[PDB]
């Protein structure tokens, strides 16, 4: 590529793997979003919350795809694995699953950053720091907040907990 | 499901298959969109066009997921298969692939409609007719228009064709 | 902490020490601010300048406290040491003391950054670079400018110097 | 000091002690504020409430520093002691600690007022009455209200109490 | 310098060399801009495009000069070498020359970043990442896009190519 | 050149030399501008003043480059020589150097005008008179004003002079 400069094939590959992971995260959140609009779940603000997260993950994927193009890498898409469950069990369980997902995505981003650093790719390093690392920290913190509140409120067994959390925190 | 009424498990299954197909179509268009943003393709309005199509396909998927929940079905997500190519070769080839994709999706929707009709599910039948069947016809027609113009203009070999089509038709 | 990820206890501790240092800097500037509104100093724009700096330092402290929470660290507050003087002697001396303070805070931030780097904490590294390192450089530069002008103008002995600097530069 | 008039050195000293106490109160509230932003507390309106209180205490400190300068006293800053805890245990416990803090600050202000009265300093007496004594009464009353509601609602053990109090009263 | 802190003389020198390189890039683009407004070239949007790039390069130079001052370095200006050609041959050739120039400038910036990293200057590292590295990637990508389109369109020999590219892409 | 008319190659050459001189003047002013932003100079309105002059010189250069193209001449760029100093010593010395620079540029413009007149090029003559000769007179007068005031005020040794001149005249 006539634009490619200081862009290691390993970084290119890792970016492609990260693209897939971001798409996967979008899919997970999409699944959660539509779990919460089931008639036997019907937590519309959980649904909206995860829908929003899903679209944010798509933007995360797209920024990496743009990065790949900008750097002269070649996007290599892979299957977006279905989420691990279709029944996310409860608002709390979904929040906990999302928290685990974000920490896993964060770990992947940190490994990607270590790779960028190993390859002396400050542009990639900065790209991750600018657009992903703090977004991950904020997302993990937010999910942590949500998990704690839901746990403290007695979710999922306390019938009012997820309902009230849905209307107040996620409203 | 206490909302489920006149909703055949075959229709539920076919809706889940259609959800996956719509997600797949979104993915195909996403791949195309970022193919045209490659430095060695750089047809930004092809890119935008397919990006828009990608997001519309996501809405197609979501409406079916909404339908599933509305009818008391249970969304069953599957892997979103990667698109058949990462290199979409040219604006014309991408348009032709999109055309083939839309006709395939249309065939799936028509089969879904035949199933809805077979199962006496007028709500599902109307749902497809209202939101999918004409949208598919419109999309197939548009892609056909685009394919014809690109062919007529000499794409992909005529160097000005895809460039001018990008700026004029997709602008 | 269920949010804690790639966050070394040393970094957590260093952030707590930095929080204290930022609070200390706020206090120093608060002291300076109210030194300059003494009836026998009465340099109201020196006062406002240092008051503004004081509040900025509080925001610096708060961002680190937020960082601590975001990363799952536990804020550990310590006494905010009183400033080294209550009588800041002159506009020039206060500016020079502030300059020294900022360079000391900068050194602490650079050590914190080296620690983040040593611990492979790019989020923390980026956090410091994004919110502190350049703010420090700009603050040190500004104080350097102020010190130079005050020195060149003949502060503190030239009776018009701090007065005119107060009204023009700090106005 | 050419402005000093009817300003007893005891009052000057007591004002300096009160400045420190107000700064200390600010610090206590700052600690509480960021306690409630912990991922395992995550009561954002408790956090905001105490943050607001913290900044109000800083204004309390500053008005006394202003008073010191206005009267020709000399501000003598002391270490701002760290708050007694970094872990404020619960919204209720923090409210109760804040209540105790405000009554302690109020006692100090009342002693300061008695001193002002003993020294025939009506300006200082009026200053305290105008800006501190009723503010303290209001603050103590508000915290008492909050404590009662939290207790009545079952805080901290009733999982919904602090959550609902956070969203409704502190919202 | 009383502001100088953690600023290695090598970094200072490298910044001065980078200032010159940025000024040089501005000059190259200025030359290109006025090449395209020759009566026998007369591609006014190529001209405007390179004029814009020229002024952007001046801002790149100025930010480095400001950085030098901010850090306490001493700007040391050198001759701005004339561009390698006055006759830039064609829109395509100018775009290709600009692409090569940007990659060369990028290489210099990456070397500067490696130096900053070697010298443990995170402020300088962040400065380059924040203001230069991604700007370079975007500029190289854009020029790559432009080069590809011009090549594909048949520039410079296809008489309509640069004309149409001028009006559509650079308009 | 099919536009070239009554345009002597000597005039073309002299215009190219004048372009370089205007670029050089821009560079001198750029150097001065960033000299006054040094932490040990810190005369921000001197800095702004010379920065403005620098950009005006670039416009002077560009109008001549425009003229060259308009007349069918061929721009021949040369190295832009670095300014004679990086340390401009004082606001007064910089003003005096700028004054000398402008008179030198003016002399070059007057020689260019004499050449235009010798070659019977009234368009070039008018071009210089319309856009350069009075601008030079105005600039030389302004710098003379500034030099006189700075001298009269006691610059550079009177510590308040350049400071006050910076804030009042250059503000
Ligand atoms: Mg993501
Ligand atoms: Mg496969
Ligand atoms: Mg599987
Ligand atoms: Mg569709
Ligand atoms: Mg029908
Ligand atoms: Mg600070
Ligand atoms: Mg202690
Ligand atoms: Mg002590
Ligand atoms: Mg780094
Ligand atoms: Mg108070
Ligand atoms: Mg009374
Ligand atoms: Mg540049
Ligand atoms: Mg030389
Ligand atoms: Mg040469
Ligand atoms: Mg000029
Ligand atoms: Mg005449």
Author numbering:
A (entry chain A), B (entry chain B), C (entry chain A), D (entry chain B), E (entry chain A), F (entry chain B): 6 to 176
Question: What does the literature reporting this entry say, word for word?
Answer:
It is a nearly spherical 24-subunits-protein with exterior diameter about 12 nm and a hollow cavity of 8 nm. Like human H-chain ferritin, the ferroxidase centers of HuFtMt are composed of A and B iron binding sites of conserved amino acid ligands His65, Glu27, Glu107, Glu61 and Glu62.
First, to eliminate possible non-specific binding of Au ions, we made a recombinant HuFtMt mutant termed ΔC (C102A/C130A) as a starting plat-form, which is devoid of any cysteine residues. ΔC shared a similar method with wt HuFtMt. As expected, no Au ions binding was observed with ΔC mutant because the inherent binding residues Cys102 and Cys130 in wt ferritin had been replaced by Ala. Consistent with the above crystal structure results, no fluorescence was observed with ΔC due to lack of Au ions binding in protein molecule.
